[PDB]
């Protein structure tokens, strides 16, 4: 059968499937686009966050004021009005950072001496990395022993005294403090990553080159996350006074790109960092996507008329190569972020190259701009700044303005009109055609780089709306008291600025996200007004209505099963019906207990809200249900010292007898005790560490807690509607060793879930690990941007 | 023509050739060895 009809069809189908899979793999290996998750920046002026950068760009403002008077510069003989005297600069102004002199060595594991030895560049890079990691939404403490690449772009320069002469207290740390490799080695060591760490020095085009490398390791597959950035800062006026010898610096210090009055390029300083991930991986895990990088190209200009002389053919070739790698055409680009350094000779060459590379096949004019007009030349910090500007403009749907462009140059020809200089803001709305942009960077060494950036896919739309009645806790942590106070003040301020936010979104973002730190605060407000009230109360200093407490290197909790003493319970049908964990575990144990003890689950767990024969089995049942829900809520137990019925409860929890079997044995105990009236576990009646198997039929306060504390467990948690013997334990807390805290579960008739919210808030208040995804799970809460960590900086300088 | 093994055979052969070429390209793009042509050094002890 199947003669020549079915036999070959199956093989043909299999071969076609294999060919399709192989070609798909080829395409993925060659041209997989990458996605930008988050960005971080530090620019001259008051700019410290990308929002301020976009606000400055939209309002059209420059950030050039003068020179710094903090870094011990002479400032005086720096310009004898004769240009050619030794030690005479030419720039009477510029754009410089005002925060480089300050640092916070306490937050990191850094000693004041070696902190004084640390270069400002890596000093800024550490903060940039931490801020971008928090902005992405990934807890910075989760990235441990994982493949994550770091790529940095710097220029060595100099900071302090020479190594030969040494210092008085800081001698051994001089070498590591000033070295380009340590700039990324320190980041890798602090964050505990394991991917490649690379520092690249390729002049003003360094930063872009870095991201190019970050776009390759991700594509090949040697790393699953990349952090690429650049930095430039000046602790010495040497660069200006040496560049003035070439007479290439404009006096005032501005960039008049494509203007009739070009005089120089000026200098500045800054820092930028981006986080990159494969698009499929990022979308699989739900990480945010801001823009997509598709193709990059790096080239050299070859032999020219000197090292500083630029080339046009190389730029054209690199642009065409980037376009070919991206697999697009010259007509798919709407705007370009040209270099626009503002020099006399560079501008015509770059303009001609861009013309010949883009505008020959163009129906619509191409917009051109340069960020160096607003901020000046930032050396290696540039390149990434252009990328940030382009992505911000594309997201906001507006093209910003370029300054000092009202007087177009006279050495270039614009007869074709294919390139229109950006002098006024231009709307950039969404449409059928996706938006794309290109960024160029050229270095004085002779290396050129080009990149193409595209908008994120418009698939986020389609979110639904769901409501609920469960209130969720709010938590916030920091490493110092003032840090906690400032964080609370900033959160209250931001919540004041932006109204309409649901409590669920803020609760979820302040959930998994910010890391776990010594100083913690937690609460649970009904609405936002009382939330602001308690937040301002925390900001003032007196913590009332919330929970606080330091906890250094504490990660364990202890479950203790108290005996009788929580009587009258306060029947909670809401616990049984609202919580499904009860409605499963307690239901199972109850129907296990039903056949033996004639009493049903209907009669008194129906409750008349308005006898050891009955209570003890039901207290055991509700105890095991509560223990199950607690352990499912992320908090695991430890050795249990449960007394009386607590012995059977601990037997059930630690694995001595099964739920049905433990229920049956407690029913037998109740039936034999209703006549006379009228996993590591810690033994109670003997006081020893025992295995969970010896507990049998034959088996049926001070020294115990001393030994448990001496072991290393310093907290006690009892599952009871009313905490009993708490003071007895509490009095012991100061009596020996470290202090002891006991957390209640319920209150006097307060069976509402809000009581459990307070219990959880008190649990997190003192060194207890809680699985927040488990307690949130399904609520529809989505990520929401929040302010980053506020620091406490101090002056750290070392004069030469 | 003859039964039906006059058109399916050629298509199967072409598919096999294409699959072999694609897999060869993948292998070459992944693990192509790199041949070293020449070397130069300048080391202590008079080594040049």
């Amino acid at each position, epitope marked *: *059968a*199947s003669t020549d009809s*079915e*036999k070959v069809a*199956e*093989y043909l189908r*299999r*071969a076609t499937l*294999d060919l399709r899979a192989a070609r798909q793999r080829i395409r993925e290996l060659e041209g997989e686009p990458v996605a930008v998750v988050a960005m971080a920046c530090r620019l001259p002026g008051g700019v410290s966050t990308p929002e301020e950068f976009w606000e400055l760009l939209s309002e059209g403002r420059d950030a050039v004021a003068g020179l710094p008077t903090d870094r011990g510069w002479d400032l005086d003989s720096l310009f004898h009005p004769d240009p050619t005297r030794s030690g005479t600069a030419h720039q009477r102004g510029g754009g410089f950072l005002t925060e480089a002199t300050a640092f916070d060595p306490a937050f990191f594991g850094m000693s004041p001496r070696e902190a004084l030895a640390v270069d400002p560049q890596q000093r800024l890079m550490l903060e940039l990395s931490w801020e971008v990691l928090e902005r992405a939404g990934i807890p910075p403490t989760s990235l441990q022993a994982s493949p994550t690449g770091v790529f940095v772009g710097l220029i060595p320069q100099e900071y302090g005294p020479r190594l030969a002469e040494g210092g008085e207290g800081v001698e051994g740390y001089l070498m590591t403090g000033t070295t380009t490799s340590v700039a990324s080695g320190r980041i890798a060591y602090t964050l505990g990553l394991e991917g490649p760490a690379i520092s690249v020095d390729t002049a003003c085009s360094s930063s872009l080159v870095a991201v190019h490398l970050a776009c390759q390791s991700l594509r090949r597959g040697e790393s699953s996350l990349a952090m690429a950035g650049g930095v430039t800062v000046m602790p010495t006026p040497g660069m200006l006074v040496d560049f003035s010898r070439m007479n290439s610096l404009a006096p005032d210090g501005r960039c008049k790109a494509f203007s009739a009055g070009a005089n120089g390029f000026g200098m500045a300083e800054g820092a930028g960092m981006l986080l990159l991930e494969r698009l499929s991986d990022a979308r699989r895990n739900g990480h945010p996507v801001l823009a997509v990088l598709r193709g990059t190209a790096v080239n050299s200009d070859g032999a020219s008329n000197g090292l500083s002389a630029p080339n046009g053919r190389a730029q054209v070739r690199v642009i065409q190569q980037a376009l070919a790698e991206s697999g697009l055409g010259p007509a798919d680009i709407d705007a370009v972020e040209a270099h626009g350094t503002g020099t006399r000779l560079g501008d015509p060459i770059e303009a001609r190259a861009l013309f010949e590379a883009y505008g020959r096949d163009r129906e619509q004019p191409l917009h051109l701009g340069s960020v160096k007009s607003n901020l000046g030349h930032t050396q290696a910090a540039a390149g990434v700044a252009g990328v940030i500007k382009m992505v911000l403009a594309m997201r906001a749907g507006t093209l910003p303005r370029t300054l000092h462009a009202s007087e177009r140059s006279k050495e270039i020809d614009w007869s074709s009109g294919a390139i229109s200089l950006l002098d006024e803001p231009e709307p950039w709305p969404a449409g059928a055609r996706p938006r794309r942009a290109g960024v160029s960077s050229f270095g004085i060494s002779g290396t050129n780089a080009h990149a193409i950036i595209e908008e994120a896919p418009q698939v986020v739309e389609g979110e639904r709306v769901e409501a609920g009645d469960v209130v969720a806790p709010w938590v916030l942590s920091a490493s110092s008291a003032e840090g906690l106070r400032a964080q609370a003040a900033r959160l209250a301020a931001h919540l004041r600025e932006h109204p309409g936010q649901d409590p669920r979104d803020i609760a979820y973002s302040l959930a998994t996200g910010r890391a776990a730190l010594p100083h913690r605060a937690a609460f649970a407000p009904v609405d936002e007004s009382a939330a602001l009230r308690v937040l301002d109360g925390l900001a003032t200093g007196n913590a009332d209505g919330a929970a606080v407490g330091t906890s250094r290197a504490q990660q364990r909790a202890v479950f203790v099963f108290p005996g009788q003493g929580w009587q009258w319970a306060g029947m909670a049908v809401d616990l049984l019906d609202t919580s499904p964990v009860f409605a499963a575990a307690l239901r199972e144990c109850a129907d296990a207990l039903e056949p033996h003890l004639d009493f049903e689950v209907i009669p008194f767990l129906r409750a008349e809200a308005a006898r050891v024969d009955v209570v003890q089995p039901v207290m055991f049942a509700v105890m095991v249900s509560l223990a199950s829900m607690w352990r499912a809520h992320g908090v695991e137990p430890a050795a249990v010292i449960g007394h009386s019925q607590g012995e059977i409860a601990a037997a059930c929890v630690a694995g001595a007898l099964s739920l049905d079997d433990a229920a049956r044995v407690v029913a037998l105990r109740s039936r034999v005790i209703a006549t006379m009236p009228g996993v590591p576990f810690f033994s109670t009646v003997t006081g020893r560490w025992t295995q969970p198997d010896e507990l049998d039929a034959g088996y049926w306060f001070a020294d115990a807690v001393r030994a448990l504390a001496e072991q290393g467990y310093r907290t006690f948690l009892e599952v009871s509607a009313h905490p009993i013997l708490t003071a007895a334990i509490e009095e012991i807390g100061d009596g020996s060793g470290a202090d002891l805290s006991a957390i209640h579960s319920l209150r006097r008739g307060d069976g509402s879930l809000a009581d459990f919210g307070e219990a959880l808030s008190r649990a997190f208040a003192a060194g207890v690990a809680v699985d927040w995804e488990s307690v949130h799970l399904g609520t529809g809460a989505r990520r929401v941007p929040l302010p980053t960590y506020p620091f406490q900086r101090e002056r750290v300088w070392l004069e030469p | 023509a003859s039964t039906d093994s006059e058109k399916v*055979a050629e298509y199967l052969r072409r598919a096999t050739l294409d699959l072999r070429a694609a897999r060869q390209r993948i292998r070459e793009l992944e693990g192509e060895p790199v041949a070293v042509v020449a070397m130069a050094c300048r080391l202590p002890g008079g080594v040049s």
Partner: antibody
Amino acid sequence: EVQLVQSGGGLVQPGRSLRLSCTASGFTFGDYAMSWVRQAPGKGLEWVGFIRSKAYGGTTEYAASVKGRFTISRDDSKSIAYLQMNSLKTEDTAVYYCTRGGTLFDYWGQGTLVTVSS
Amino acid sequence: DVVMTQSPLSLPVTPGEPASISCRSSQSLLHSNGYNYLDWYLQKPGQSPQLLIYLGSNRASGVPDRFSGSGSGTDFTLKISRVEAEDVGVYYCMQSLQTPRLTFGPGTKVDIKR
């Protein structure tokens, strides 16, 4: 993907019927004539029977032994394959796999248990 | 009739150095069109069967490489260049000249050399 996910099974006394369902998904079920194979505990895999595609007629073939008590259904609307039992015996206790091809045994299912005893 | 295919029974292996299994036949399996109607199957311990090589020498997608089939229409062979610890189980030769294939045959076995 191209999951199969079989269903059915259990324990039945000798002389009884049962239904086994194979749920094709993730691919076009139009012309992918499937088959049923049986693996006894302690021995190798022995073929039970395949059902052709509707393009070539939708006929079926069986291999002796189980010829008179085994029937195959080809519900195209839900892309479901059915194996129907008839008067089972004790020696038929085996794990049943639902394949994908008729001559080239492609992606396999997960198997059932079905034991006959008393 | 049939070709009564057979294999060299059990073969213990060790991690590292390669291994191979031959497969003989009585009637040539080379079809007139110019192809060999043979394939190989692998059954893992306590798991569903799997397909490795079809039509003489062709690796199916998803196979973790390291497997190579070869041979003329009478003396087929399947060789593994690198032997790991998870590729242990039962291996079956299979033909396609006769459509009413009743059984997969005995099949060879592999284990850890000791």
